Amino acid sequence: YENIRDTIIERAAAMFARQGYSETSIGDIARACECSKSRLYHYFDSKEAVLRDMLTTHVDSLLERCRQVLYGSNEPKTRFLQIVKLFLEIYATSRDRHVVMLTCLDALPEDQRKALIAKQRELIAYVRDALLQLRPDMAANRTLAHVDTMLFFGMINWTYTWYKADGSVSPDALAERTVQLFLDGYLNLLSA
Amino acid sequence: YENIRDTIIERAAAMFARQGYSETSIGDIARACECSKSRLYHYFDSKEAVLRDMLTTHVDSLLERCRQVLYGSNEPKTRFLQIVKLFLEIYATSRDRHVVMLTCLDALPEDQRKALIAKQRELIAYVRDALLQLRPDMAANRTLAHVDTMLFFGMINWTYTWYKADGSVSPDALAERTVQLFLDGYLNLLSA
């Protein structure tokens, strides 16, 4: 039943993202959907199943949307900026599930953790490769290519701790700023 | 007793940083110091007291060391690079307590959370102000000054998720790279 399913997922995501996974019980979820503990197991076998599903659909979505961006523009600089705007858009729309991705992966077992870690590596690879399309002269040094990519991810992944998507600075404005800073540097940024 | 005190703190920091705060019990700590649950309360009143103390001494240390850096060099570009090298040095030496700062603040009540949040704001202020000493022309826009500062923090604070301080790239090398990228941009970075 694809309606009540997503309410559980929706309501669980919110709790896992405030108090966290170990803090949130199956009972907590049951009564957040204003429901009995029984009716949850009609859709999910475990608390881990709820988590595994929301993480899976979320990274799967991010990967597909990245691909559409990749397969769209001709120009490397445009594709890169579009990828960053996508990630921040997904924050603006899907903050809870985003935070849970960035925060809750360890709560899982080993096989599914690593299936999801594999998907996160795909996503990282897309960004790394798009950066090296801007600087093909830098592709020879894989060590520093990984460093530069992960420093970039830090800028955007840390946003959940401080950034409010309904504030003065829009997701698109933040993305443009992030790219101008990362590509061209704080010291060359035009001052209004 | 200032000897056994720090073992508790040391051993607790390690557990809070792997499995987390709610996951780690007072019993877990008692037996990590290969000890009875009684002897912990000789030094600490609560699990929260253990946490509050390690967070307090850690942010207090970071603040003092930042000040020594600030009061040292004449040149803004040097002071900024020295601040980043300091933060990454503290990761190389104090990873566990660092992760716990970046990760566990919410496990606390309200008054002490906000005393510590206030100290984190001081630290952020040091970095913001040092950036605006590089670009005084940008100090007029406080909104974007906060955005640029927090994007910077993301690069360095996200390191706990991916960076190994005993690897190919040293803490000082990572700091130099982070600063070159942030100040001068990915597109102007010299390629070996």
Side-chain angles (χ1 to χ4, degrees), chain A residues 22 131 135 137-138 148 150-151 154-155 157-158 162 177-178 181-187 189 191, chain B residues 22 131 135 137-138 148 150-151 154-155 157-158 162 177 181-187 189 191:
Chain A
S22 61
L131 284 177
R135 288 295 303 267
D137 61 319
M138 289 216 301
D148 295 339
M150 298 314 285
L151 287 166
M155 297 188 229
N157 289 356
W158 195 242
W162 65 266
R177 189 71 167 189
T178 301
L181 288 160
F182 187 74
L183 294 190
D184 292 294
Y186 187 69
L187 299 180
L189 218 41
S191 200
Chain B
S22 61
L131 284 177
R135 288 295 303 267
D137 61 319
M138 289 216 301
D148 295 339
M150 298 314 285
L151 287 166
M155 297 188 229
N157 289 356
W158 195 242
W162 65 266
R177 189 71 167 189
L181 288 160
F182 187 74
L183 294 190
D184 292 294
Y186 187 69
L187 299 180
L189 218 41
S191 200

mmCIF file of all heavy atoms in Angstrom, chain A residues 22 131 135 137-138 148 150-151 154-155 157-158 162 177-178 181-187 189 191, chain B residues 22 131 135 137-138 148 150-151 154-155 157-158 162 177 181-187 189 191:
data_model
loop_
_atom_site.group_PDB
_atom_site.id
_atom_site.type_symbol
_atom_site.label_atom_id
_atom_site.label_comp_id
_atom_site.label_asym_id
_atom_site.label_seq_id
_atom_site.Cartn_x
_atom_site.Cartn_y
_atom_site.Cartn_z
ATOM 1 N N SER A 22 19.168 5.591 17.054
ATOM 2 C CA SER A 22 19.086 4.821 18.308
ATOM 3 C C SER A 22 18.123 5.454 19.305
ATOM 4 O O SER A 22 17.523 4.756 20.120
ATOM 5 C CB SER A 22 20.465 4.651 18.949
ATOM 6 O OG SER A 22 21.024 5.910 19.277
ATOM 7 N N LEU A 131 34.822 17.704 -12.062
ATOM 8 C CA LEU A 131 35.928 18.617 -11.724
ATOM 9 C C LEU A 131 37.157 18.412 -12.631
ATOM 10 O O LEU A 131 37.737 19.384 -13.134
ATOM 11 C CB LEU A 131 36.344 18.461 -10.242
ATOM 12 C CG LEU A 131 35.426 19.100 -9.186
ATOM 13 C CD1 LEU A 131 35.942 18.795 -7.806
ATOM 14 C CD2 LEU A 131 35.415 20.615 -9.405
ATOM 15 N N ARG A 135 39.608 20.561 -15.228
ATOM 16 C CA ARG A 135 41.069 20.582 -15.126
ATOM 17 C C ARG A 135 41.657 19.237 -15.568
ATOM 18 O O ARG A 135 42.089 18.469 -14.722
ATOM 19 C CB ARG A 135 41.504 20.859 -13.666
ATOM 20 C CG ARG A 135 41.294 22.304 -13.132
ATOM 21 C CD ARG A 135 42.152 23.357 -13.871
ATOM 22 N NE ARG A 135 43.608 23.081 -13.847
ATOM 23 C CZ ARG A 135 44.461 23.565 -12.940
ATOM 24 N NH1 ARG A 135 44.029 24.323 -11.937
ATOM 25 N NH2 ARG A 135 45.764 23.284 -13.021
ATOM 26 N N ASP A 137 44.337 18.616 -16.814
ATOM 27 C CA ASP A 137 45.762 18.597 -16.501
ATOM 28 C C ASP A 137 46.030 18.057 -15.092
ATOM 29 O O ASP A 137 47.148 17.714 -14.765
ATOM 30 C CB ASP A 137 46.405 19.971 -16.728
ATOM 31 C CG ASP A 137 45.789 21.095 -15.840
ATOM 32 O OD1 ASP A 137 44.551 21.175 -15.631
ATOM 33 O OD2 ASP A 137 46.578 21.927 -15.373
ATOM 34 N N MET A 138 44.988 17.973 -14.271
ATOM 35 C CA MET A 138 45.123 17.492 -12.896
ATOM 36 C C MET A 138 44.731 16.021 -12.651
ATOM 37 O O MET A 138 44.817 15.493 -11.534
ATOM 38 C CB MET A 138 44.367 18.463 -11.982
ATOM 39 C CG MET A 138 45.159 19.809 -11.910
ATOM 40 S SD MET A 138 45.104 20.645 -10.270
ATOM 41 C CE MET A 138 43.159 20.758 -10.347
ATOM 42 N N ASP A 148 40.678 17.008 -3.417
ATOM 43 C CA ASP A 148 39.967 18.215 -3.843
ATOM 44 C C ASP A 148 38.451 17.966 -3.868
ATOM 45 O O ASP A 148 37.655 18.843 -3.495
ATOM 46 C CB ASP A 148 40.450 18.694 -5.242
ATOM 47 C CG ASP A 148 41.927 19.138 -5.236
ATOM 48 O OD1 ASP A 148 42.458 19.455 -4.155
ATOM 49 O OD2 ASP A 148 42.570 19.180 -6.304
ATOM 50 N N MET A 150 36.721 15.748 -2.021
ATOM 51 C CA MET A 150 36.171 15.610 -0.684
ATOM 52 C C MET A 150 36.150 16.977 0.048
ATOM 53 O O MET A 150 35.303 17.209 0.883
ATOM 54 C CB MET A 150 36.959 14.541 0.120
ATOM 55 C CG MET A 150 36.896 13.138 -0.464
ATOM 56 S SD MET A 150 35.082 12.627 -0.958
ATOM 57 C CE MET A 150 34.484 12.333 0.853
ATOM 58 N N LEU A 151 37.064 17.889 -0.303
ATOM 59 C CA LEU A 151 37.014 19.233 0.283
ATOM 60 C C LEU A 151 35.789 19.971 -0.237
ATOM 61 O O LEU A 151 35.061 20.598 0.528
ATOM 62 C CB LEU A 151 38.275 20.017 -0.021
ATOM 63 C CG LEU A 151 39.504 19.530 0.773
ATOM 64 C CD1 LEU A 151 40.811 20.097 0.204
ATOM 65 C CD2 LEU A 151 39.381 19.813 2.342
ATOM 66 N N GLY A 154 32.589 18.499 1.542
ATOM 67 C CA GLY A 154 32.519 19.176 2.846
ATOM 68 C C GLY A 154 31.773 20.494 2.815
ATOM 69 O O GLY A 154 30.927 20.720 3.683
ATOM 70 N N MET A 155 32.104 21.381 1.868
ATOM 71 C CA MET A 155 31.366 22.655 1.752
ATOM 72 C C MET A 155 29.884 22.468 1.657
ATOM 73 O O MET A 155 29.129 23.183 2.322
ATOM 74 C CB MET A 155 31.719 23.428 0.478
ATOM 75 C CG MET A 155 33.112 23.860 0.385
ATOM 76 S SD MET A 155 33.224 25.041 -1.229
ATOM 77 C CE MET A 155 34.661 24.284 -2.001
ATOM 78 N N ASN A 157 28.043 19.373 1.989
ATOM 79 C CA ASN A 157 27.455 18.412 2.948
ATOM 80 C C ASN A 157 27.321 18.999 4.349
ATOM 81 O O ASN A 157 26.432 18.576 5.113
ATOM 82 C CB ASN A 157 28.243 17.084 3.024
ATOM 83 C CG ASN A 157 28.090 16.240 1.768
ATOM 84 O OD1 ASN A 157 27.338 16.597 0.878
ATOM 85 N ND2 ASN A 157 28.807 15.119 1.687
ATOM 86 N N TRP A 158 28.188 19.950 4.720
ATOM 87 C CA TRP A 158 28.110 20.599 6.043
ATOM 88 C C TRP A 158 26.934 21.556 6.199
ATOM 89 O O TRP A 158 26.622 21.966 7.317
ATOM 90 C CB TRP A 158 29.421 21.369 6.360
ATOM 91 C CG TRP A 158 29.622 21.766 7.791
ATOM 92 C CD1 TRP A 158 29.735 23.044 8.301
ATOM 93 C CD2 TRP A 158 29.704 20.888 8.890
ATOM 94 N NE1 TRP A 158 29.906 22.988 9.657
ATOM 95 C CE2 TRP A 158 29.893 21.672 10.041
ATOM 96 C CE3 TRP A 158 29.647 19.495 9.013
ATOM 97 C CZ2 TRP A 158 30.025 21.115 11.311
ATOM 98 C CZ3 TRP A 158 29.798 18.944 10.283
ATOM 99 C CH2 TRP A 158 29.966 19.749 11.405
ATOM 100 N N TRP A 162 23.945 24.408 9.372
ATOM 101 C CA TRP A 162 23.886 25.884 9.512
ATOM 102 C C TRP A 162 22.905 26.567 8.556
ATOM 103 O O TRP A 162 22.358 27.648 8.862
ATOM 104 C CB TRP A 162 25.286 26.492 9.312
ATOM 105 C CG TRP A 162 25.907 26.332 7.899
ATOM 106 C CD1 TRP A 162 26.765 25.329 7.462
ATOM 107 C CD2 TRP A 162 25.753 27.229 6.795
ATOM 108 N NE1 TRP A 162 27.121 25.551 6.139
ATOM 109 C CE2 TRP A 162 26.530 26.719 5.717
ATOM 110 C CE3 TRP A 162 25.025 28.433 6.606
ATOM 111 C CZ2 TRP A 162 26.583 27.347 4.481
ATOM 112 C CZ3 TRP A 162 25.086 29.054 5.366
ATOM 113 C CH2 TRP A 162 25.874 28.508 4.327
ATOM 114 N N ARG A 177 27.307 30.727 -5.428
ATOM 115 C CA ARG A 177 28.354 31.177 -4.513
ATOM 116 C C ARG A 177 29.400 30.086 -4.238
ATOM 117 O O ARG A 177 30.594 30.352 -4.309
ATOM 118 C CB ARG A 177 27.748 31.550 -3.164
ATOM 119 C CG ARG A 177 28.774 32.260 -2.194
ATOM 120 C CD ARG A 177 29.051 33.627 -2.717
ATOM 121 N NE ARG A 177 29.754 34.498 -1.771
ATOM 122 C CZ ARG A 177 29.929 35.798 -1.986
ATOM 123 N NH1 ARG A 177 29.433 36.344 -3.089
ATOM 124 N NH2 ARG A 177 30.593 36.539 -1.127
ATOM 125 N N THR A 178 28.940 28.903 -3.830
ATOM 126 C CA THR A 178 29.806 27.720 -3.608
ATOM 127 C C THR A 178 30.733 27.424 -4.816
ATOM 128 O O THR A 178 31.950 27.243 -4.680
ATOM 129 C CB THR A 178 28.939 26.495 -3.301
ATOM 130 O OG1 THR A 178 28.164 26.784 -2.128
ATOM 131 C CG2 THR A 178 29.797 25.230 -3.078
ATOM 132 N N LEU A 181 33.300 30.426 -5.413
ATOM 133 C CA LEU A 181 34.349 30.337 -4.398
ATOM 134 C C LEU A 181 35.305 29.179 -4.707
ATOM 135 O O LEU A 181 36.546 29.377 -4.748
ATOM 136 C CB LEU A 181 33.735 30.144 -3.000
ATOM 137 C CG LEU A 181 33.007 31.314 -2.316
ATOM 138 C CD1 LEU A 181 32.071 30.768 -1.211
ATOM 139 C CD2 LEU A 181 34.013 32.283 -1.688
ATOM 140 N N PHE A 182 34.741 27.984 -4.890
ATOM 141 C CA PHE A 182 35.554 26.762 -5.104
ATOM 142 C C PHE A 182 36.392 26.863 -6.391
ATOM 143 O O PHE A 182 37.567 26.584 -6.361
ATOM 144 C CB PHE A 182 34.710 25.465 -5.138
ATOM 145 C CG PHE A 182 35.575 24.205 -5.188
ATOM 146 C CD1 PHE A 182 36.263 23.782 -4.059
ATOM 147 C CD2 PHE A 182 35.742 23.502 -6.370
ATOM 148 C CE1 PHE A 182 37.099 22.648 -4.095
ATOM 149 C CE2 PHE A 182 36.574 22.375 -6.406
ATOM 150 C CZ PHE A 182 37.244 21.967 -5.265
ATOM 151 N N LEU A 183 35.781 27.278 -7.505
ATOM 152 C CA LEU A 183 36.488 27.350 -8.793
ATOM 153 C C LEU A 183 37.427 28.548 -8.942
ATOM 154 O O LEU A 183 38.528 28.421 -9.471
ATOM 155 C CB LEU A 183 35.487 27.350 -9.972
ATOM 156 C CG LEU A 183 34.678 26.052 -10.136
ATOM 157 C CD1 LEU A 183 33.945 26.103 -11.466
ATOM 158 C CD2 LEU A 183 35.523 24.763 -10.042
ATOM 159 N N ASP A 184 36.981 29.713 -8.499
ATOM 160 C CA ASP A 184 37.725 30.944 -8.777
ATOM 161 C C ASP A 184 38.339 31.613 -7.544
ATOM 162 O O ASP A 184 39.225 32.489 -7.668
ATOM 163 C CB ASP A 184 36.846 31.903 -9.603
ATOM 164 C CG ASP A 184 36.586 31.358 -11.025
ATOM 165 O OD1 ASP A 184 37.559 31.259 -11.812
ATOM 166 O OD2 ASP A 184 35.443 30.993 -11.351
ATOM 167 N N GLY A 185 37.919 31.181 -6.351
ATOM 168 C CA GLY A 185 38.614 31.630 -5.142
ATOM 169 C C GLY A 185 38.005 32.822 -4.453
ATOM 170 O O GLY A 185 37.549 33.758 -5.092
ATOM 171 N N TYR A 186 38.012 32.778 -3.116
ATOM 172 C CA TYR A 186 37.579 33.884 -2.266
ATOM 173 C C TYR A 186 38.210 35.235 -2.648
ATOM 174 O O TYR A 186 37.533 36.291 -2.626
ATOM 175 C CB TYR A 186 37.941 33.566 -0.818
ATOM 176 C CG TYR A 186 37.397 34.554 0.150
ATOM 177 C CD1 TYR A 186 36.040 34.619 0.385
ATOM 178 C CD2 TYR A 186 38.237 35.432 0.835
ATOM 179 C CE1 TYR A 186 35.505 35.553 1.267
ATOM 180 C CE2 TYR A 186 37.702 36.365 1.730
ATOM 181 C CZ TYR A 186 36.337 36.395 1.950
ATOM 182 O OH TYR A 186 35.764 37.346 2.820
ATOM 183 N N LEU A 187 39.505 35.199 -2.954
ATOM 184 C CA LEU A 187 40.251 36.416 -3.298
ATOM 185 C C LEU A 187 39.870 37.105 -4.636
ATOM 186 O O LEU A 187 40.203 38.282 -4.842
ATOM 187 C CB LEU A 187 41.751 36.157 -3.206
ATOM 188 C CG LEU A 187 42.334 35.735 -1.841
ATOM 189 C CD1 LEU A 187 43.868 35.520 -1.958
ATOM 190 C CD2 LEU A 187 42.050 36.758 -0.689
ATOM 191 N N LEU A 189 36.527 36.908 -5.880
ATOM 192 C CA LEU A 189 35.090 37.011 -5.882
ATOM 193 C C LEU A 189 34.764 38.499 -5.975
ATOM 194 O O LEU A 189 35.390 39.324 -5.292
ATOM 195 C CB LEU A 189 34.602 36.454 -4.553
ATOM 196 C CG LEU A 189 33.367 35.609 -4.261
ATOM 197 C CD1 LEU A 189 33.060 34.530 -5.281
ATOM 198 C CD2 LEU A 189 33.614 34.984 -2.916
ATOM 199 N N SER A 191 32.938 41.845 -5.184
ATOM 200 C CA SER A 191 32.247 42.377 -4.029
ATOM 201 C C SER A 191 31.210 43.414 -4.433
ATOM 202 O O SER A 191 31.549 44.427 -5.054
ATOM 203 C CB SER A 191 33.237 42.991 -3.050
ATOM 204 O OG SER A 191 32.628 43.084 -1.772
ATOM 205 N N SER B 22 24.288 8.197 22.905
ATOM 206 C CA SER B 22 23.164 7.388 23.409
ATOM 207 C C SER B 22 23.471 5.895 23.369
ATOM 208 O O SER B 22 22.955 5.132 24.183
ATOM 209 C CB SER B 22 21.877 7.678 22.635
ATOM 210 O OG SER B 22 22.032 7.354 21.265
ATOM 211 N N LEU B 131 39.197 36.099 7.456
ATOM 212 C CA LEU B 131 38.837 36.165 6.028
ATOM 213 C C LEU B 131 38.552 37.605 5.559
ATOM 214 O O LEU B 131 39.041 38.032 4.504
ATOM 215 C CB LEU B 131 37.616 35.266 5.720
ATOM 216 C CG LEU B 131 37.865 33.750 5.641
ATOM 217 C CD1 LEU B 131 36.565 33.029 5.403
ATOM 218 C CD2 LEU B 131 38.822 33.475 4.479
ATOM 219 N N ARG B 135 39.841 40.352 2.703
ATOM 220 C CA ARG B 135 38.933 41.056 1.793
ATOM 221 C C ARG B 135 38.127 42.115 2.554
ATOM 222 O O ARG B 135 36.949 41.906 2.796
ATOM 223 C CB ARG B 135 37.949 40.059 1.136
ATOM 224 C CG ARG B 135 38.532 39.102 0.058
ATOM 225 C CD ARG B 135 39.043 39.842 -1.201
ATOM 226 N NE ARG B 135 38.025 40.692 -1.863
ATOM 227 C CZ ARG B 135 37.240 40.297 -2.868
ATOM 228 N NH1 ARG B 135 37.299 39.051 -3.328
ATOM 229 N NH2 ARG B 135 36.372 41.148 -3.422
ATOM 230 N N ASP B 137 36.969 44.729 1.581
ATOM 231 C CA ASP B 137 35.934 45.258 0.699
ATOM 232 C C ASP B 137 34.636 44.450 0.792
ATOM 233 O O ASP B 137 33.597 44.897 0.350
ATOM 234 C CB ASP B 137 36.437 45.386 -0.745
ATOM 235 C CG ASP B 137 36.872 44.024 -1.368
ATOM 236 O OD1 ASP B 137 37.515 43.166 -0.711
ATOM 237 O OD2 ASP B 137 36.577 43.839 -2.556
ATOM 238 N N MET B 138 34.707 43.263 1.387
ATOM 239 C CA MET B 138 33.540 42.391 1.518
ATOM 240 C C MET B 138 32.826 42.416 2.885
ATOM 241 O O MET B 138 31.818 41.735 3.113
ATOM 242 C CB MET B 138 33.958 40.979 1.096
ATOM 243 C CG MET B 138 34.178 40.958 -0.452
ATOM 244 S SD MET B 138 33.674 39.390 -1.276
ATOM 245 C CE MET B 138 34.923 38.366 -0.184
ATOM 246 N N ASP B 148 30.175 32.651 3.426
ATOM 247 C CA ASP B 148 31.503 32.250 2.954
ATOM 248 C C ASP B 148 32.272 31.522 4.067
ATOM 249 O O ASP B 148 32.989 30.542 3.809
ATOM 250 C CB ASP B 148 32.320 33.475 2.455
ATOM 251 C CG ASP B 148 31.691 34.140 1.215
ATOM 252 O OD1 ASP B 148 30.900 33.482 0.513
ATOM 253 O OD2 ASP B 148 31.979 35.319 0.924
ATOM 254 N N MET B 150 30.975 29.777 6.635
ATOM 255 C CA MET B 150 30.417 28.465 6.913
ATOM 256 C C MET B 150 30.728 27.477 5.758
ATOM 257 O O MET B 150 30.847 26.293 5.984
ATOM 258 C CB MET B 150 28.892 28.569 7.183
ATOM 259 C CG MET B 150 28.522 29.404 8.399
ATOM 260 S SD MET B 150 29.607 28.962 9.955
ATOM 261 C CE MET B 150 28.708 27.296 10.327
ATOM 262 N N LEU B 151 30.896 27.983 4.530
ATOM 263 C CA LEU B 151 31.300 27.101 3.428
ATOM 264 C C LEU B 151 32.731 26.634 3.648
ATOM 265 O O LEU B 151 33.036 25.453 3.499
ATOM 266 C CB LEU B 151 31.167 27.795 2.088
ATOM 267 C CG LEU B 151 29.704 27.974 1.635
ATOM 268 C CD1 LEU B 151 29.587 28.965 0.469
ATOM 269 C CD2 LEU B 151 28.984 26.588 1.295
ATOM 270 N N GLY B 154 32.741 23.928 6.521
ATOM 271 C CA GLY B 154 32.363 22.664 5.871
ATOM 272 C C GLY B 154 33.532 21.901 5.284
ATOM 273 O O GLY B 154 33.628 20.693 5.510
ATOM 274 N N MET B 155 34.389 22.568 4.500
ATOM 275 C CA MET B 155 35.580 21.888 3.954
ATOM 276 C C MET B 155 36.406 21.217 5.006
ATOM 277 O O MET B 155 36.835 20.075 4.816
ATOM 278 C CB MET B 155 36.558 22.859 3.286
ATOM 279 C CG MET B 155 36.031 23.560 2.118
ATOM 280 S SD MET B 155 37.577 24.549 1.315
ATOM 281 C CE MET B 155 36.789 26.156 1.140
ATOM 282 N N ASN B 157 35.612 20.862 8.516
ATOM 283 C CA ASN B 157 34.860 20.067 9.512
ATOM 284 C C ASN B 157 34.411 18.718 8.959
ATOM 285 O O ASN B 157 34.244 17.759 9.736
ATOM 286 C CB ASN B 157 33.633 20.821 10.075
ATOM 287 C CG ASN B 157 34.023 21.975 10.986
ATOM 288 O OD1 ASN B 157 35.193 22.166 11.266
ATOM 289 N ND2 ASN B 157 33.044 22.754 11.448
ATOM 290 N N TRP B 158 34.194 18.617 7.642
ATOM 291 C CA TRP B 158 33.794 17.342 7.016
ATOM 292 C C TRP B 158 34.907 16.304 6.951
ATOM 293 O O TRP B 158 34.638 15.133 6.679
ATOM 294 C CB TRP B 158 33.250 17.577 5.581
ATOM 295 C CG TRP B 158 32.484 16.441 4.973
ATOM 296 C CD1 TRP B 158 32.802 15.726 3.834
ATOM 297 C CD2 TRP B 158 31.300 15.874 5.482
ATOM 298 N NE1 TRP B 158 31.855 14.766 3.611
ATOM 299 C CE2 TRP B 158 30.919 14.840 4.610
ATOM 300 C CE3 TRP B 158 30.505 16.152 6.600
ATOM 301 C CZ2 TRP B 158 29.775 14.072 4.815
ATOM 302 C CZ3 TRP B 158 29.352 15.393 6.790
ATOM 303 C CH2 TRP B 158 29.014 14.364 5.917
ATOM 304 N N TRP B 162 36.293 11.351 6.117
ATOM 305 C CA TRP B 162 37.041 10.779 4.971
ATOM 306 C C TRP B 162 38.562 10.803 5.140
ATOM 307 O O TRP B 162 39.284 9.951 4.579
ATOM 308 C CB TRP B 162 36.669 11.517 3.672
ATOM 309 C CG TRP B 162 37.069 13.014 3.596
ATOM 310 C CD1 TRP B 162 36.287 14.116 3.923
ATOM 311 C CD2 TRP B 162 38.311 13.540 3.115
ATOM 312 N NE1 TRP B 162 36.995 15.287 3.694
ATOM 313 C CE2 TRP B 162 38.227 14.960 3.180
ATOM 314 C CE3 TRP B 162 39.503 12.944 2.627
ATOM 315 C CZ2 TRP B 162 39.281 15.780 2.803
ATOM 316 C CZ3 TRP B 162 40.550 13.774 2.251
ATOM 317 C CH2 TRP B 162 40.418 15.179 2.333
ATOM 318 N N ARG B 177 46.655 23.002 0.904
ATOM 319 C CA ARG B 177 45.733 22.715 -0.192
ATOM 320 C C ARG B 177 44.363 23.383 0.005
ATOM 321 O O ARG B 177 43.849 24.007 -0.916
ATOM 322 C CB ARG B 177 45.478 21.215 -0.286
ATOM 323 C CG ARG B 177 44.675 20.797 -1.581
ATOM 324 C CD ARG B 177 45.567 20.961 -2.764
ATOM 325 N NE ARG B 177 45.056 20.341 -3.989
ATOM 326 C CZ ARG B 177 45.785 20.226 -5.094
ATOM 327 N NH1 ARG B 177 47.036 20.668 -5.091
ATOM 328 N NH2 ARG B 177 45.280 19.692 -6.183
ATOM 329 N N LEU B 181 42.966 26.320 -2.471
ATOM 330 C CA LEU B 181 41.691 26.113 -3.156
ATOM 331 C C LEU B 181 40.690 27.211 -2.781
ATOM 332 O O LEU B 181 40.093 27.858 -3.679
ATOM 333 C CB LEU B 181 41.105 24.734 -2.803
ATOM 334 C CG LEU B 181 41.752 23.459 -3.371
ATOM 335 C CD1 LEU B 181 41.341 22.241 -2.511
ATOM 336 C CD2 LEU B 181 41.308 23.226 -4.818
ATOM 337 N N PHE B 182 40.484 27.399 -1.477
ATOM 338 C CA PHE B 182 39.475 28.364 -0.976
ATOM 339 C C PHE B 182 39.813 29.804 -1.405
ATOM 340 O O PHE B 182 38.954 30.497 -1.896
ATOM 341 C CB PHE B 182 39.289 28.313 0.560
ATOM 342 C CG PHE B 182 38.130 29.188 1.039
ATOM 343 C CD1 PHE B 182 36.818 28.793 0.821
ATOM 344 C CD2 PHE B 182 38.364 30.416 1.636
ATOM 345 C CE1 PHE B 182 35.734 29.605 1.216
ATOM 346 C CE2 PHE B 182 37.288 31.223 2.028
ATOM 347 C CZ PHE B 182 35.986 30.804 1.808
ATOM 348 N N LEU B 183 41.068 30.231 -1.228
ATOM 349 C CA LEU B 183 41.468 31.608 -1.554
ATOM 350 C C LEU B 183 41.654 31.885 -3.047
ATOM 351 O O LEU B 183 41.258 32.934 -3.546
ATOM 352 C CB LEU B 183 42.766 31.997 -0.808
ATOM 353 C CG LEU B 183 42.637 32.067 0.723
ATOM 354 C CD1 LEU B 183 43.896 32.705 1.286
ATOM 355 C CD2 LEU B 183 41.387 32.826 1.220
ATOM 356 N N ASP B 184 42.280 30.954 -3.751
ATOM 357 C CA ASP B 184 42.677 31.216 -5.137
ATOM 358 C C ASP B 184 41.935 30.381 -6.184
ATOM 359 O O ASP B 184 41.964 30.702 -7.394
ATOM 360 C CB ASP B 184 44.209 31.112 -5.263
ATOM 361 C CG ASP B 184 44.923 32.253 -4.504
ATOM 362 O OD1 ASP B 184 44.773 33.429 -4.916
ATOM 363 O OD2 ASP B 184 45.593 31.998 -3.488
ATOM 364 N N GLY B 185 41.229 29.338 -5.735
ATOM 365 C CA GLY B 185 40.336 28.630 -6.655
ATOM 366 C C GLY B 185 40.923 27.409 -7.312
ATOM 367 O O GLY B 185 42.082 27.394 -7.698
ATOM 368 N N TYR B 186 40.090 26.371 -7.444
ATOM 369 C CA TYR B 186 40.430 25.144 -8.159
ATOM 370 C C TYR B 186 41.020 25.392 -9.558
ATOM 371 O O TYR B 186 41.976 24.701 -9.986
ATOM 372 C CB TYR B 186 39.173 24.290 -8.302
ATOM 373 C CG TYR B 186 39.443 22.944 -8.871
ATOM 374 C CD1 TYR B 186 40.134 22.006 -8.133
ATOM 375 C CD2 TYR B 186 39.012 22.602 -10.154
ATOM 376 C CE1 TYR B 186 40.421 20.748 -8.655
ATOM 377 C CE2 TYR B 186 39.292 21.335 -10.676
ATOM 378 C CZ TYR B 186 39.976 20.414 -9.903
ATOM 379 O OH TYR B 186 40.303 19.140 -10.414
ATOM 380 N N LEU B 187 40.426 26.345 -10.273
ATOM 381 C CA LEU B 187 40.853 26.665 -11.641
ATOM 382 C C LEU B 187 42.256 27.313 -11.792
ATOM 383 O O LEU B 187 42.821 27.312 -12.896
ATOM 384 C CB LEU B 187 39.777 27.479 -12.352
ATOM 385 C CG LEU B 187 38.385 26.841 -12.536
ATOM 386 C CD1 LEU B 187 37.439 27.826 -13.276
ATOM 387 C CD2 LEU B 187 38.410 25.480 -13.312
ATOM 388 N N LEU B 189 44.860 26.544 -9.472
ATOM 389 C CA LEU B 189 45.761 25.737 -8.687
ATOM 390 C C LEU B 189 46.813 25.201 -9.653
ATOM 391 O O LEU B 189 46.480 24.760 -10.764
ATOM 392 C CB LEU B 189 44.945 24.588 -8.115
ATOM 393 C CG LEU B 189 45.037 23.936 -6.739
ATOM 394 C CD1 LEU B 189 45.247 24.889 -5.579
ATOM 395 C CD2 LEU B 189 43.743 23.191 -6.559
ATOM 396 N N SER B 191 49.218 22.613 -11.289
ATOM 397 C CA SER B 191 49.216 21.173 -11.432
ATOM 398 C C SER B 191 50.628 20.628 -11.576
ATOM 399 O O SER B 191 51.351 21.006 -12.504
ATOM 400 C CB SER B 191 48.377 20.757 -12.632
ATOM 401 O OG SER B 191 48.015 19.392 -12.493
#
